[PDB]
A paper describes a structure:
It gets activated through phosphorylation of Thr357 and Ser358 in its pseudokinase domain by RIP3 kinase and subsequently oligomerizes via its executioner domain and inserts into the membrane. To this end, displacement of the auto-inhibitory brace helix (α-helix 6) from the four-helix bundle is required, which depends on a specific composition of phospholipids in the membrane. Currently, two classes of compounds are reported to inhibit [name] by covalently binding to Cys86 in the short α-helix 4 located on top of the four-helix bundle, which comprises α-helices 1, 2, 3, and 5.
Here, we present the high-resolution structures of the human [name] executioner domain in complex with a covalent inhibitor of the xanthine class solved by X-ray crystallography and in solution by NMR spectroscopy. Next, we determined the protein–ligand costructure with the newly synthesized xanthine Cpd 3. The binding pose of Cpd 3 was very similar in the NMR and the X-ray structures of the [name]:Cpd 3 complex. Overall structural changes upon complex formation were minor, and the overall fold of [name] was preserved. This resulted in a stacking interaction with the aromatic ring of the xanthine core, therefore creating an additional contact between α-helix 6 and the four-helix bundle. Here, we report that the xanthine class of inhibitors acts by stabilizing the packing of α-helix 6 against the four-helix bundle through the formation of a stabilizing π–π-stacking interaction between Phe148 located in α-helix 6 and the xanthine core. Mutation of Phe148 to alanine leads to loss of the stabilization of the auto-inhibited state of [name] by xanthine class compounds, confirming the key role of the observed π–π-stacking interaction for the activity of the xanthine class.
Residue numbers in the entry: 0 to 49, 52 to 123, 129 to 150
């Protein structure tokens, strides 16, 4: 439980750091890192106590860990310029992290509801809109 929480928080931090160093598609990569850092903030607060998670909370945390591992795999893949160029030429909307953003948003909704109801923690609605704007800003930076 404590080890699981530390692993997820470390994943989020490595994803943010890797997104910050990305040389291409900076708006989309920076948005992914910023969103991940914001999602792990209440998990950092829960970790700062040292309570026991229910099995429903453990299930939701493990699903969130799986979405973060997928995001880390995508950032690692896109650290190679050729993989970015290949993916974007094949993509329809030019949104680099479309699939993993959907998974992060869906798994986060279940997890935050359990943190609020079970651990008394005090949403990805604008995300698809922000994704299209960041993708356009990135496409424009590339087209100069
Ligand atoms: C390859 N093809 C790209 C890009 C890119 O960043 N963007 C935003 C695109 O729209 N396309 C089609 N890359 C990545 O490499 C950028 C050029 O580096 C020299």
């Amino acid at each position: 439980p404590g080890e699981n929480l530390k692993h997820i928080i470390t994943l989020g931090q490595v994803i943010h750091k890797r997104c910050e160093e990305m040389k291409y598609c900076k708006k989309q990569c920076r948005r992914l890192g910023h969103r991940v850092l914001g999602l792990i903030k209440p998990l950092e607060m829960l970790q700062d106590q040292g309570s026991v998670p229910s099995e429903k909370l453990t299930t939701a945390m493990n699903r969130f860990k799986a979405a973060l591992e997928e995001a880390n795999g995508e950032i690692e893949k896109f650290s190679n310029r050729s993989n970015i160029c290949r993916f974007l030429t094949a993509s329809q909307d030019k949104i680099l992290f479309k699939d993993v953003n959907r998974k992060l948003s869906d798994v986060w909704k279940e997890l935050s509801l359990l943190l609020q109801v079970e651990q008394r923690m005090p949403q990805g609605a604008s995300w698809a809109q922000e994704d299209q704007q960041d993708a356009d800003e990135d496409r424009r930076a590339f087209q100069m």
